[PDB]
RNA sequence: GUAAGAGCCUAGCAUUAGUACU
C-alpha cells in the first residue's frame, strides 16, 4: 500500500456535538509544516 | 437495477434496449465484480458499457459509462475545482479501497447552488458524438478492406498525443486528467483578459449591451469591484465606457467579468477600454 | 427515579419469596472418565444425556440412573448437548470444533455442522424452526440449517467465547452471553443484534429462560441478573451473591432457579423475588481433589422435580425436592427485603 | 493469546462433505415423545412410578 | 440595530451589526449573520441535543449512531435500576401465540431464503441456461430537458439479461481485506467499581514461574 | 380445483 | 393504529390479486358480489372469492388467445367470455365446464355485453365492423 | 475454480485430525484456563498475570509427568487450585490415551510409528 | 491510589484555577453571556489565550515527569 | 526534510501497519506507539485514525480514551477533544476519571458553564460521595454558593447519609450560616430519621453546637445520643463527652 | 407585530413578525403561536445552507392548518427579499397556497424571492439557528434526532 | 425522496409489440412516440 | 551445502471509457 497518499484503513473520528471544521484546518497546517527534525527526535 | 448514466449516454431514443450482464465486469476503480449494462445509445452509436460499480458511480455523482459528473457533464477535476473541495482522500490501493467500501456498507453533491463556472464551461446540447464507433484502426494504417461497411469510423485519429492515454482511476478521482487539464487551461486563458502594458488605462469597454440595459444598471454592475471614475453610454454601438480611479479595481472588474457575464440577461463582452 | 427513591420503593414493594421445598441430593452416578460438562433431558423425561471431557456422551435412565448407552464420536470434550423435542435427534458440540446431529433411531451421527474455527461451547435448538445455534471460542454464533447442514447465518459482534445460548420462538430468537461480559439479543431474520446488554462485569457463562415468563436470567462470577424480554430490560439482581463463577443455571416451572458454581456450590433461588432459599456445596466423589469440584451443567427434568447436575468430579448428581416439606418444617434461608439504600 | 474471530459471486468449489445427504428431517411421531402426545400425560406420575419401582425392586423387600 | 421600518439607508456589514443575528429582508444586499452562508457549510454535520419539557438535555445521540440507531442501547443510569413494577408473572408475559406464529413463519421464510441461496448460489453443478427475460422499466431522469431524449420526458428501458456461457470459468478472483471496525460501541452499564483492597491486591500477586 | 392464484395484502406504491 | 373506518369485510383495504401470467384485460364482479371473473391475456379466466381468502378456486381454460372481455350472466352461475381467438364462450362457473362456444366472428371479438333483463342474450362486437346479437338457446 | 478464483485460503475451518489432536488439546486447554483466569480475578486486578499462570500450568504438567511435587510459595490458592484441576484434566486425558493406545498396541491394531514410542 | 491521585487532581484543579483565571475574568465572560441552557454543542465565547493555558498547563506537568535477566531478579530481591 | 522525509515516513508507516496487523489486536501497547509517532509527524488525521482503530478494537480501555483525548487537547484541538470526551463518558460512564478529566479540560479553558454541564451529566450517573463533593467544590471555586447549596440539597437526597449531611453542615458553618448548619443537623435527624442514629453523626452534632458556644445544646446532644446510641458504640462518644466536660 | 418566541429541543430563539409588508401571514403566525399549535411540532425538514422548515404538527410535512381554515395568499414584495440567514418565511406548495408551515433561512436564498412570503426575522438566538442547521439529517433532510418545538408563544 | 439515484426507476408492463414498435419508430426513423404519453419526439 | 526470498534488465495478460471554444 502507499501509506502516505492514503491513511491506512482510515477510521475517521465520529461526529459529535461540537463542530470540528477549524480543528481539521489546523491539522492540515501542522502537516504542511516541515521543520528540521532528527531521527531521534521523531522516534523519541 | 438501472445504470447510473449520463443522459447523453442513453442517446436520443426514448426507448432503450439494454443488455444486463450481471457480474459482467470489474469496476475500473474499486476492481469489484459488478453488474454491467451495455447498450446502443442510438442508430449512429456503438455499444457502450458501464465502466464502474454502481456505488463507485454514485459516490462521485458520475455516470457509470463516461465517468463524467452527472449534473454538468464535465470531468471530475473541473467539477472538483469549481466545487473547491479537497483532494480525494479515498485510498488508491484496492485493499484500502475495499476496506473503505466494506466499512461504508455496514453503517454533498446534491445541495450546492448551480456553479456558474461549471455552467459557463459546459455543453448546451448533448455530446452524442461521444456515443459513436471508434476509429477504424485498419483505416489508419491504410489496410482496411471492409470499405464503407466497417462498423468503425472511417476517419483518422485527430487527437492530442498526450491525450488518448487517459486512466480510468484518474478520470474518476481527478488527478492529472488531461482533458480537464486542457479545459482548465482554456478557462485560464478566458479568465486571462490581457491587462495591457499601459498601466494607467483605467477604463473598461463594455460591448454588446442590449438597449434595455441602462447606464445606471451597468453602474450597479461595476460599482462592486471598485470606485467608478465615469460611466459613459452609447447605444449606437450598444457599448459603454467605464473608468475607475484605481487600476486594481479595473483589474478586479476584468477578472470577474471577463468570462462573459450576463447583466440582466444580455450576453455582453468586456475589453480593456 | 434514583437509587434512593427506588431503594425505598424496593423496601416497600419487593415481591416476597414464594416458599419452595428444599432439594436433597439423592444420587451420584460415577462412570464418566472426565469432567461431566453438559446434560440434556429427553422430552419424554425417561433418559438424559451427559457429555464429558472423556469425549463421550452417555445416555442414562432418568429414574434408575442406569447407563443405557455410551456414544463416542467427539475427539475432544463434549461441551454442549441438546435433545430435540420435535426430531429424534440429539445435538452435541465439542472442543473439537465439531457439531454433530445424532440420529437417536440409529444411535449414530448422521449430520455434522462444520465451520467453527475454535472449540464450540454452547448449543441451542430453535424450538419451532429446524435450526440450531452454536457459539464458540471464535466469538460467533453460527446458525445452522438442521437439514442441509448449511451455515445459514453468523451472528457477529461478541469479542470472546460465546459461552451461553438461548433460543426461543419470539423475538429475540437467540440470546447469547459471552466472555466479553455482554449479552446479545439477536434478530434472527436480520442477522443482527437487537440489543447488547453490558450490565455484567464478568463473563456470562450461564443463561436460562423462564419456562413460562418472557424473561431470562444471566449469571456471572459477580451477579445473576434477570432481564425482561423482548428488549432486555434489566429487572434485578438476585438478592445475594453466590460468590462463585456460575457455570450453569436452570430455571423450574415453580420458579426454582438453580445456579451451579465453579466451586461446586449449588444455590436455589426464588425466581420472582430473587432470594436464595438454599445453598449447598458439593461433595466430591472419592479420589477427587476438592479443587476438582465444579458444577458444569444442570438441567431440570421435564417435570421440574429432578435436577441433574454435571460435575467436575466426573459424577452426575441428582437432586429431588424434599417435597414432604412444608413452609413450617422447611423454610430454608429466610428473607429480608432489600431494605438498604444503595447505589446501582 | 487471541483466537481468530469467525465472522461470515459465491465460490463454485464444491466439497465432498457438502453434497446432498440426509435431505429430510425425521420428526417425532406418535410414540416417540412427540409434543402433542406428551401434554396428554402426567410425566410426574410416570417418573415417581419408575423411581418407586427402581428403588423398591432394587431393595428386594416388601 | 434599528427596529422594524426604521432601517432605511442603515445597512449592516459585520456580524456585530445583527445584534443576535437574523437578517433583514427589507435590505437588498446579501447579509451574513454569524457568517452563515459563506461558501460551503463545512463538513460532517454535528449531533443534536434533545431537551425535555423541563430542560433535561439528552446526549444519547453520541451513542445511538450507525447500527446503534436501530437497536436497544441502554445509556442511562435508570437502566441499571431494579424494576419492581415489572416482576409480576403478569408483567413478564410471553407474546400472543398468534404473534409468535407470525414470527416463526417469517423467520422460516427468511432462513429458507438464505439457506437456498447458500445451497444453489454456491452449488456449481447447476447447469447454466437461457437469457433472463426482458423486464421493462420506466426511468425518469434527474435531468430532463427538451434536448435530453430528444425532447421526451421519460424512458422505457428493455432490461435484457444476457445469458452467460456455460463454459465460462469463474470470472473474478476473490479479494482479501481486514474486517472492518464493526458496529459502534455500546455504553458499559456497570455498577460502581468495587474497591480492590491492597490485601486482595496481594492475594492475587502471582509469583514468576521458574522452570 | 384451486388454481394458481394468491391474494396478498400490499400497499399501493407511490411515485413522487 | 390509524383505525380509519374499515368499510368492507376484506382482510385489508387494498388487496392485490396475482396468479395470472398475462395482461388482465377485463374483470367482473358476481351479481351477488362474492366472486371475481378475471380474464387475462394468457387466454385464461381466474375465479376468485371476494372474501375470507381471496382464493382463486378455479382457472377455466379453453380459449386459444387472450380473453379480452368477461361479464357474468344475470344469475351469476354462467359466464360470458370474449376473446381474440374469434370465439365467445359460455361457461358454467361452479363447475369448470364450457357450455356453448360460438365462433361466428371473423376477427378478434373485442367487446361483449350480456343483457341484464329478459332472456339469456348478449351482444358481441368484433374487428369485422359487425355487431352481432346472440341468443343463448 | 481454484485456478480462476484463487485458493480460498482464508478462515475456512481446519478439521482436528490425528496430527492436530494433541496440539489442539493444548490450545483448548489453555483457552479454558484463560477463561477461568479472567473470571477469577477480582474487579480491579491487572489482568495480565495470566501468562505467568499459564507458565505455572505448563510447569505443573511437567512436574506431574516427572512425579515431582510442587509448591509455589506465593501462589494464591484459587490460582493453584485452578492449576491442579486442569493438570488433572490433562493427566486424565493423557493416561486414558495411554490406556487406549496400549490396548491397540497389544491387539496389533494399527498405530502410528510414533504412537509406539509415545506409549512406551 | 485514586484517592491519592484524586487529591492530586484537586491539586491540579485548584492550582490551575489559581494560575490561569481570575474572578472578574470569569464574571465578565458571564456578563457577556446570559446562558451559563440548551446551548450544548455550540462553542462558547472565551479568550483565545485560555486554550494554550490548558495546553501549557498540561505541558507543565510534562517537565515534572544479561539485561533482561537483571530485571527479573531485581523483581525478586524486591519481593523475596 | 523533503521527499527523504516522506519516504522515511512511508517506511515507518509500513513498519507500523505490519506490526499492527500482526500484534495489534491481541496485545495492547502498539496503537499508542503508532499514534504518538503520527502525532510527532504532526499528522493528526492519521493519528486520529490510529486512535480510532485502537478504540475500534477495545473501547473499554480508559487508558486509550485518555491518551486519545490528551493528544487532542495538547494540540489545541478542543472540539475534537470534547467529542472524544463525550464518547468516552457516554460509553464508560462509571469511570470517574473520564468525567474528572473532561471537567478539568473544560475549566482549564475557562468554560465553567461547560464544565458544569459535564458535572450535571455525571451527577445523573450517580457518582460516589467524591463526585458530588467535587461538584460542590467546583461551584465554590467560582464563588457560587447558591449553586453549591442546591448541589448539597441534591447530594443529601441522592446519597442520604450521615456523611452527606455532616458535610452539608460543615459547608454551612464555613459558609457564614450557623442557624443553617443547625438547620442541616436538625434536618438530618428528621429526614435521615432512622439510621441517623450513629456515632459520628452525634459526634459532629456535639462539635458543631460546641463551636457555636451553645454548650447546653451540646449537653442535650451528648445525652440524647447516649440515650439513643447503643452503649456498645458508647466508648468513643463517651470519652469525647468527657473531653467536653 | 413584534416578538414571537420559539423554544426548541436544540434551544430557544425569537422572531419578530413583520406588520406592514405582510399582515395576513404575520397575524397567522401570531395567533397560531398563541393557540398552542406549534407545540411538539418537530422541525421535519432541515437542509444545511438552505432552511429549517417547521410548523406541520402531523410530522409528515404535507399540510399545516391555518387560522383562515385552509390556504391563503402570499405577500411577495419587491421589498421583502430573502437576503441572509434567519429570515423567517412561509412555506408554500406554489403560488398562494400557504398553510402554517414556515422556514427559517440559514443562508441567502435568492431563488425563493417571488415564491415564499417572508414575514419576519430571528431577533434573538441566531446561535440556536446556526447549531440547528448543522444538525444530523437523513437522506430526506429529516433530523435524525427529533428537533421538537417544545413551546411557541408571543412575547 | 427519489427512487433510484439520478431519477425514478419504475416498473412497467406493456405488450411486447409496443416497446419494439416505438423503439423502431424512433430508432430507425428518427421520430417516434414519447413513452410518457406526451406527443411525439424529435425530427 | 539446502533452498527461500528482495531487486535489476529484458521480460505478451487484461481493457473498450474518455478527445469541446463568441
Ligand atoms: Zn454517461
Ligand atoms: Zn474499416
Q: How far apart are CA I12 and CA E89, in angstroms?
A: 54
Give DSSP secondary structure letters for J109-136.
Answer: TT-HHHHHHHHHHHHHT---HHHHHHHH
Contact present, E151 and L42 (Cβ < 8 Å): yes
Q: How far apart are CA E135 and CA L13, in angstroms?
A: 8
The C-alpha cell of D24 is what?
Answer: 429430510
Question: What SS3 state is found at J220?
Answer: helix
CA dihedral C104, C109, C113, C116 (to 10 degrees): 110
Angle at B39 between CA B36 and CA B42, to 5 degrees: 155
Cβ contact B260 with chain M strand, < 7 A: yes
| J91 part of contact set with chain A, CB < 8 Å | no
Listed residue (B123, E42, C55) closest to K131, CA to CA: E42
Q: Tell me: is residue B28 an annotated ligand-binding position.
A: no
Residue B141 alpha carbon to ligand 2 centre in Å = 10
CA dihedral C195, C198, C200, C206 (to 10 degrees): 30
Q: Kind and range of the H or E element at C61?
A: strand C56-61
Set K13, K28, K53, K88: catalytic member: K53
What count of other Cβ atoms lies within 10 Å of the Cβ of residue B148? 5
Contact present, B177 and B77 (Cβ < 8 Å): yes
Phi, psi of B209 (to 5 degrees): -75, 120
Q: How far apart are CA G18 and CA E97, in angstroms?
A: 29
Phi, psi of K19 (to 5 degrees): -80, -50
Q: Kind and range of the H or E element at E107?
A: helix E97-116
Give DSSP secondary structure letters for C248-317.
Answer: EEEE-SS-EEEEEETTSEEEEEETTT--EEEEEEPPPPTT--SSS--EEEEEE-TTSSEEEEEETTS-EE
Q: From the DSSP assignment, how many helices (H) and strands (E) are in chain B?
A: 9, 9
How many angstroms separate the Cα of J53 from the Cα of each of A21, B96, G109? Answer: 22, 14, 73
Q: How far apart are CA E177 and CA C237, in angstroms?
A: 43
| D23 part of contact set with chain E, CB < 8 Å | no
Contact present, C160 and C146 (Cβ < 8 Å): no
How many angstroms separate the Cα of G59 from the Cα of each of C70, G39, G84, K7? Answer: 58, 10, 18, 64
Method used experimentally: cryo-EM
Contact present, C157 and C115 (Cβ < 8 Å): no
Phi, psi of I49 (to 5 degrees): -65, -45
The C-alpha cell of C292 is what?
Answer: 476438582
Listed residue (G53, G59, G62, G72) closest to G20, CA to CA: G59
Residues 6+ apart with CB under 8 A from C47: C41, C59, C60, C61, C62, C68
Angle between helices J199-211 and J162-175 (to 10 degrees): 10
Nucleic strand M contacts from chain B, 62-91, CB < 7 Å:
65-68, 73-75, 78
Inter-chain CB proximity I39 and K11 less than 8 Å = yes
The C-alpha cell of B111 is what?
Answer: 445541495
Q: How far apart are CA J73 and CA I53, in angstroms?
A: 11
Residues 6+ apart with CB under 8 A from B59: none
Q: How far apart are CA J237 and CA J244, in angstroms?
A: 10
Residues 6+ apart with CB under 8 A from G46: F3, F5, G17, G19, G20, G36, G37, G38, G40, G56, G58, G59
Burial C126-141 (b: 16+ CB within 10 A, else e): bebbbbbbbbbbbbbb
Inter-chain CB proximity A17 and E49 less than 8 Å = yes
Inter-chain CB proximity C148 and E115 less than 8 Å = yes
Q: Kind and range of the H or E element at K16?
A: strand K12-17
Contact present, B54 and B60 (Cβ < 8 Å): no
Q: How far apart are CA H17 and CA B123, in angstroms?
A: 69
Cβ contact B166 with chain M strand, < 7 A: yes
Q: How far apart are CA J2 and CA B214, in angstroms?
A: 57
DSSP code, position E96 = P
Residue B157 alpha carbon to ligand 2 centre in Å = 13
Task: Write down the residue that cell numbers 509500513 correspond to.
Answer: J14
On chain M, which bases lie within 7 A of the protein's CB atoms? 15-22
Task: Write down the residue that cell numbers 439607508 correspond to.
Answer: E9
Q: How far apart are CA C168 and CA B221, in angstroms?
A: 75
End-to-end CA distance of chain F: 42
Set K103, K106, K121, K132: catalytic member: K103
Name chain J contacts of D1, Cβ cutoff 8 Å: 26-27
Question: What SS3 state is found at C151?
Answer: strand
Give DSSP secondary structure letters for G96-117.
Answer: TEEEEEE---SS---EEEE-SS
CA of C98 to C1' of M3 (A): 38
Q: How far apart are CA H80 and CA L14, in angstroms?
A: 80
Give DSSP secondary structure letters for I1-58.
Answer: -TTHHHHHHHHHHHHHHHHH--HHHHHHHHHH-S-----TTSPP---THHHHHHHHHH
CA of B183 to C1' of M20 (A): 8
β-bridge mates for residue G113, sequence order: G123
Cβ contact B26 with chain M strand, < 7 A: yes
Give DSSP secondary structure letters for C152-203.
Answer: EEEE----S-EEEEEE-SSSS-EEEEETTS-EEEEETTTTEEEEEE---SS-
Contact present, K14 and K155 (Cβ < 8 Å): yes
Query: D-contacting residues of E 125-144, CB under 8 Å?
Result: 125
Chains E and H touch (3+ CB pairs under 8 A): yes
Per DSSP bridges, beta strands K118-124 and K87-90 are antiparallel
- Sign of the CA dihedral H60, H63, H69, H70? negative
Question: What SS3 state is found at K25?
Answer: helix
The C-alpha cell of J155 is what?
Answer: 447530594
Angle at G39 between CA G37 and CA G41, to 5 degrees: 165
Burial of J132 (0-12, 13-18, 19+ CB in 10 A): buried
DSSP code, position B171 = H
Q: How far apart are CA E77 and CA E80, in angstroms?
A: 5
Task: Write down the residue that cell numbers 416417540 correspond to.
Answer: D32
| Maximum Cα–Cα distance across chain J | 86
Q: How far apart are CA B105 and CA E180, in angstroms?
A: 10
Burial of J40 (0-12, 13-18, 19+ CB in 10 A): middle
Listed residue (E71, B41, B135) closest to C197, CA to CA: E71
End-to-end CA distance of chain D: 62
CA of H114 to C1' of M1 (A): 30
The C-alpha cell of J96 is what?
Answer: 470517574
Q: How far apart are CA E174 and CA G88, in angstroms?
A: 60
Amino acid at each position: 500500500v502507499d501509506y502516505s497518499s492514503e491513511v491506512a484503513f482510515e477510521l475517521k473520528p465520529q461526529a459529535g456535538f461540537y463542530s470540528t471544521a477549524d480543528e481539521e484546518k489546523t491539522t492540515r497546517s501542522m502537516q504542511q509544516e516541515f521543520r528540521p527534525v532528527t531521527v531521534e527526535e521523531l522516534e523519541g | 437495477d438501472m445504470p447510473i448514466v449520463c443522459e447523453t449516454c442513453l442517446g436520443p431514443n426514448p426507448f432503450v434496449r439494454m443488455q444486463r450482464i450481471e457480474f459482467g465486469g470489474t469496476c475500473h476503480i474499486s476492481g469489484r465484480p459488478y453488474t454491467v449494462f451495455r447498450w446502443r445509445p442510438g442508430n449512429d452509436a456503438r455499444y457502450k458499457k458501464t465502466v464502474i460499480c454502481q456505488e463507485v458511480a454514485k459516490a462521485k455523482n458520475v455516470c457509470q459509462v463516461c465517468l463524467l459528473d452527472l449534473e454538468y457533464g464535465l470531468p471530475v477535476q473541473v467539477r472538483d475545482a469549481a466545487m473547491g473541495v479537497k483532494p480525494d482522500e479515498e485510498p488508491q490501493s484496492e485493499v484500502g479501497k475495499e476496506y473503505k467500501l466494506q466499512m461504508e456498507a455496514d453503517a454533498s453533491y446534491a445541495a450546492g447552488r448551480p456553479n456558474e463556472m461549471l455552467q459557463k464551461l459546459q455543453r448546451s446540447q448533448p455530446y452524442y458524438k461521444r456515443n459513436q464507433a471508434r476509429v477504424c484502426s485498419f483505416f489508419a494504417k491504410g489496410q482496411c478492406t471492409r470499405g464503407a461497411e466497417c462498423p468503425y469510423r472511417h476517419e483518422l485519429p485527430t487527437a492530442d498525443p498526450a491525450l488518448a492515454n487517459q486512466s480510468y482511476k484518474d478520470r474518476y478521482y481527478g488527478t492529472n486528467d488531461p482533458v480537464a487539464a486542457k479545459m482548465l487551461k482554456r478557462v485560464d486563458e478566458l479568465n486571462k483578459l490581457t491587462p495591457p502594458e499601459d498601466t494607467s488605462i483605467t477604463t473598461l469597454y463594455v460591448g454588446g449591451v442590449d438597449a434595455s440595459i441602462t447606464e445606471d444598471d451597468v453602474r450597479d454592475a461595476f460599482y462592486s469591484f471598485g470606485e467608478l471614475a465615469s460611466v459613459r453610454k452609447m447605444d449606437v454601438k450598444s457599448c459603454a465606457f467605464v473608468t475607475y480611479t484605481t487600476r486594481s479595481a479595473a483589474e478586479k472588474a476584468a477578472e470577474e467579468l471577463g468570462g462573459n457575464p450576463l447583466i440582466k440577461g444580455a450576453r455582453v463582452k468586456l475589453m480593456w477600454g | 427515579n434514583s437509587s434512593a427513591a427506588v431503594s425505598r420503593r424496593i423496601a416497600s414493594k419487593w415481591p416476597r419469596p414464594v416458599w419452595h421445598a428444599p432439594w436433597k441430593m439423592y444420587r451420584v452416578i460415577s462412570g464418566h472418565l472426565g469432567w461431566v460438562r453438559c446434560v440434556a433431558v429427553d422430552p419424554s423425561n425417561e433418559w438424559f444425556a451427559t457429555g464429558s471431557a472423556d469425549r463421550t456422551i452417555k445416555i442414562w435412565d432418568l429414574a434408575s440412573g442406569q447407563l443405557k448407552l455410551t456414544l463416542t464420536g467427539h475427539i475432544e470434550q463434549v461441551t454442549g448437548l441438546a435433545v430435540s423435542s420435535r426430531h429424534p435427534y440429539m445435538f452435541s458440540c465439542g472442543l473439537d470444533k465439531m457439531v454433530k446431529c445424532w440420529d437417536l433411531e440409529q444411535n449414530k451421527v448422521i449430520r455434522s455442522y462444520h465451520g467453527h474455527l475454535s472449540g464450540v461451547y454452547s448449543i441451542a435448538l430453535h424450538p419451532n424452526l429446524d435450526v440450531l445455534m452454536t457459539g464458540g471460542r471464535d466469538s460467533v454464533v453460527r446458525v445452522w440449517d438442521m437439514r442441509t447442514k448449511v451455515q445459514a447465518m453468523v451472528l457477529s459482534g461478541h469479542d470472546q467465547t460465546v459461552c451461553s445460548l438461548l433460543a426461543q420462538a419470539p423475538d429475540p430468537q437467540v440470546i447469547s452471553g459471552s466472555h466479553d461480559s455482554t449479552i446479545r439479543l439477536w434478530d434472527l431474520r436480520k442477522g443482527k443484534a437487537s440489543a447488547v446488554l453490558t450490565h455484567h462485569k464478568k463473563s456470562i457463562r450461564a443463561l436460562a429462560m423462564h419456562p413460562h415468563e418472557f424473561a431470562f436470567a444471566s449469571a456471572s462470577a459477580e451477579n445473576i441478573k434477570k432481564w425482561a424480554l423482548p428488549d432486555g430490560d434489566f429487572l434485578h439482581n438476585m438478592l445475594s451473591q453466590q460468590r462463585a463463577i456460575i457455570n450453569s443455571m436452570a430455571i423450574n416451572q415453580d420458579g426454582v432457579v438453580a445456579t451451579g458454581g465453579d466451586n461446586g456450590s449449588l444455590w436455589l433461588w426464588d425466581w420472582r423475588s430473587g432470594h436464595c432459599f438454599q445453598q449447598d456445596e458439593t461433595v466430591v466423589q472419592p479420589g477427587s481433589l476438592e479443587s476438582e469440584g465444579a458444577l458444569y451443567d444442570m438441567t431440570f427434568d421435564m417435570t421440574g422435580s429432578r435436577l441433574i447436575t454435571a460435575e467436575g468430579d466426573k459424577t452426575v448428581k441428582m437432586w429431588k425436592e424434599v417435597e414432604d416439606a412444608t413452609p413450617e418444617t422447611h423454610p430454608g434461608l429466610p428473607f429480608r427485603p432489600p431494605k438498604d439504600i444503595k447505589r446501582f | 493469546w487471541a483466537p481468530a474471530i469467525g465472522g461470515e459471486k459465491p465460490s463454485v468449489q464444491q466439497s465432498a462433505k457438502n453434497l446432498p445427504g440426509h435431505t429430510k428431517l425425521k420428526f417425532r411421531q406418535t410414540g416417540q415423545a412427540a409434543e402433542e402426545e406428551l401434554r396428554a400425560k402426567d410425566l410426574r406420575a410416570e417418573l415417581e412410578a419408575k423411581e418407586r419401582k427402581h428403588f423398591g425392586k432394587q431393595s428386594g423387600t416388601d | 440595530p434599528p427596529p422594524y421600518l426604521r432601517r432605511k439607508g442603515w445597512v449592516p456589514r459585520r456580524a456585530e451589526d445583527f445584534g443576535d443575528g437574523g437578517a433583514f429582508p427589507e435590505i437588498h444586499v446579501a447579509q451574513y449573520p454569524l457568517d452563515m452562508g459563506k461558501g460551503s457549510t463545512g463538513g460532517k454535520q454535528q449531533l443534536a441535543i434533545s431537551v425535555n419539557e423541563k430542560g433535561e438535555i439528552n446526549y444519547d445521540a453520541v451513542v445511538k449512531q450507525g447500527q446503534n440507531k436501530d437497536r436497544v442501547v441502554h445509556s442511562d443510569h435508570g437502566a441499571l435500576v431494579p424494576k419492581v413494577d415489572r416482576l409480576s408473572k403478569e408483567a413478564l408475559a410471553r407474546p400472543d401465540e398468534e404473534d409468535v406464529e407470525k414470527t416463526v413463519a417469517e423467520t422460516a421464510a427468511a432462513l429458507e431464503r438464505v439457506v437456498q441461496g447458500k445451497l444453489s448460489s454456491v452449488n456449481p453443478t447447476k447447469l447454466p441456461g437461457g437469457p433472463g427475460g426482458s423486464t421493462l422499466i420506466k426511468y425518469t431522469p434527474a435531468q430532463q430537458g427538451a434536448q435530453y431524449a430528444s425532447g421526451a420526458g421519460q424512458r422505457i428501458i428493455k432490461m435484457q439479461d444476457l445469458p452467460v456461457d456455460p463454459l465460462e470459468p469463474p470470472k473474478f478472483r476473490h479479494v482479501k481485506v481486514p474486517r472492518g471496525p464493526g458496529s459502534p460501541p455500546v455504553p458499559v452499564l456497570h455498577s460502581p467499581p468495587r474497591p480492590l483492597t491492597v490485601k486482595d491486591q496481594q492475594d492475587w500477586k502471582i509469583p514468576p514461574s521458574i522452570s | 380445483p384451486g388454481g394458481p392464484g394468491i391474494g396478498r395484502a400490499v400497499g399501493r406504491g407511490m411515485p413522487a | 393504529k390509524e383505525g380509519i373506518t374499515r368499510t368492507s369485510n376484506l382482510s385489508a383495504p387494498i388487496i392485490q390479486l396475482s396468479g395470472h401470467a398475462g395482461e388482465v384485460f377485463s374483470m367482473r364482479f358476481s351479481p351477488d358480489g362474492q366472486c371475481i371473473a378475471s380474464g387475462s391475456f394468457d387466454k385464461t379466466i381466474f375465479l376468485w372469492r371476494t372474501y375470507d381468502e381471496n382464493e382463486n378456486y378455479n382457472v377455466i381454460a379453453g380459449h386459444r388467445n387472450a380473453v379480452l372481455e368477461v361479464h357474468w350472466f344475470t344469475d351469476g352461475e354462467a359466464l360470458l367470455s370474449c376473446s381474440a381467438d374469434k370465439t365467445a364462450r359460455c361457461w358454467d362457473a361452479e363447475t369448470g365446464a364450457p357450455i356453448k362456444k360460438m365462433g361466428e366472428h371473423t376477427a378478434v371479438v373485442n367487446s361483449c355485453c350480456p343483457l341484464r333483463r329478459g332472456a339469456k342474450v348478449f351482444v358481441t362486437g368484433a374487428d369485422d365492423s359487425t355487431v352481432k346479437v346472440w341468443d343463448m338457446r | 475454480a481454484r485456478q480462476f478464483e484463487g485458493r480460498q485460503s482464508k478462515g475456512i475451518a481446519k478439521t482436528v485430525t490425528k496430527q492436530r489432536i494433541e496440539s489442539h488439546f493444548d490450545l483448548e486447554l489453555r483457552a479454558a484456563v484463560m477463561h477461568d483466569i479472567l473470571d477469577m480475578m477480582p474487579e480491579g486486578v491487572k489482568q495480565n498475570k495470566a501468562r505467568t499462570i499459564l507458565q505455572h500450568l505448563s510447569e505443573a504438567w511437567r512436574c506431574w509427568k516427572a512425579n515431582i511435587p510442587w509448591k509455589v510459595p506465593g501462589l494464591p490458592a484459587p490460582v493453584e487450585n485452578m492449576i491442579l484441576r486442569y493438570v488433572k484434566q490433562k493427566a486424565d486425558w493423557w493416561t486414558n490415551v495411554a490406556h487406549y493406545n496400549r490396548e491397540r498396541i497389544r491387539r496389533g491394531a494399527t498405530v502410528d510409528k510414533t504412537v509406539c514410542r509415545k506409549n512406551l | 491510589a485514586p484517592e491519592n491521585l484524586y487529591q492530586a487532581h484537586l491539586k491540579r484543579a485548584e492550582a490551575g484555577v489559581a494560575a490561569a483565571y481570575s474572578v472578574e475574568d470569569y464574571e465578565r465572560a458571564k456578563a457577556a453571556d446570559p446562558e451559563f441552557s440548551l446551548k450544548y454543542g455550540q462553542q462558547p465565547k472565551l479568550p483565545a489565550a485560555n486554550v494554550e493555558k490548558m495546553v501549557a498547563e498540561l505541558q507543565e506537568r510534562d517537565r515534572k515527569k544479561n539485561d533482561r535477566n537483571a530485571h527479573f531478579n531485581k523483581k525478586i530481591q524486591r519481593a523475596f | 526534510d523533503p521527499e527523504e522525509l516522506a519516504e522515511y515516513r512511508l517506511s515507518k508507516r509500513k513498519q507500523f501497519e505490519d506490526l499492527v496487523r500482526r500484534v495489534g489486536r491481541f496485545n495492547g501497547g502498539v496503537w499508542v506507539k503508532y499514534a504518538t509517532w503520527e502525532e510527532q509527524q504532526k499528522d493528526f488525521r492519521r493519528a486520529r485514525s490510529v486512535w480510532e482503530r485502537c478504540l475500534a478494537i477495545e473501547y473499554r480501555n480508559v487508558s486509550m480514551w485518555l491518551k486519545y483525548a490528551e493528544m487532542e487537547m495538547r494540540h489545541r484541538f478542543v472540539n475534537h477533544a470534547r467529542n472524544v470526551w463525550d464518547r468516552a463518558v457516554s460509553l464508560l460512564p462509571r469511570i470517574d476519571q473520564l468525567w474528572y478529566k473532561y471537567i478539568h479540560m473544560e475549566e482549564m479553558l475557562g468554560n465553567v458553564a461547560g464544565a458544569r454541564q459535564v458535572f450535571e451529566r455525571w451527577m445523573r450517573f450517580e457518582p460516589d460521595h467524591t463526585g458530588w463533593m467535587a461538584y460542590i467544590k467546583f461551584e465554590l471555586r467560582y464563588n457560587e454558593v447558591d449553586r453549591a447549596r442546591a448541589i448539597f440539597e441534591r447530594y443529601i437526597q441522592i446519597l442520604p447519609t450521615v456523611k452527606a449531611w455532616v458535610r452539608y453542615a460543615k459547608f454551612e458553618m464555613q459558609n457564614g450560616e450557623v442557624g443553617l448548619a443547625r438547620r442541616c443537623y436538625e434536618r438530618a435527624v428528621d429526614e435521615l430519621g432512622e439510621d441517623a442514629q450513629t456515632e459520628e453523626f452525634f459526634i459532629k452534632f456535639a462539635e458543631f453546637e460546641e463551636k457555636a458556644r451553645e454548650v447546653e445544646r451540646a449537653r442535650a446532644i451528648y445525652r440524647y445520643a447516649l440515650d439513643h446510641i447503643p452503649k456498645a458504640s458508647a466508648p468513643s462518644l463517651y470519652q469525647r463527652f468527657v473531653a467536653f466536660e | 407585530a413584534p416578538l414571537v418566541q420559539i423554544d426548541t429541543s436544540m434551544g430557544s430563539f425569537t422572531v419578530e413578525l413583520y406588520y406592514k409588508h405582510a399582515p395576513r401571514t404575520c397575524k397567522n403566525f401570531e395567533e397560531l403561536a398563541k393557540k398552542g399549535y406549534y407545540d411538539g411540532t418537530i422541525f421535519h425538514r432541515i437542509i444545511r445552507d438552505f432552511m429549517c422548515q417547521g410548523g406541520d404538527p402531523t410530522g409528515t410535512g404535507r399540510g399545516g392548518e391555518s387560522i383562515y381554515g385552509g390556504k391563503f395568499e402570499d405577500e411577495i414584495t419587491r421589498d421583502l427579499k430573502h437576503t441572509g440567514a434567519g429570515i423567517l418565511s412561509m412555506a408554500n406548495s406554489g403560488p398562494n397556497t400557504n398553510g402554517s408551515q414556515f422556514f427559517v433561512t440559514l443562508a441567502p436564498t435568492p431563488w425563493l424571492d417571488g415564491k415564499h412570503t417572508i414575514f419576519g426575522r430571528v431577533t434573538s438566538g441566531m446561535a440556536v439557528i446556526k447549531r440547528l442547521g448543522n444538525v444530523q439529517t437523513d437522506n430526506l433532510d429529516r433530523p435524525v434526532t427529533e428537533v421538537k418545538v417544545i413551546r411557541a408563544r408571543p412575547v | 425522496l427519489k427512487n433510484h439515484f439520478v431519477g425514478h426507476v419504475e416498473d412497467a408492463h406493456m405488450h411486447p409489440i409496443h416497446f419494439e414498435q416505438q423503439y423502431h419508430n424512433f430508432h430507425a426513423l428518427g421520430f417516434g412516440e414519447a413513452p410518457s404519453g406526451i406527443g411525439v419526439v424529435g425530427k
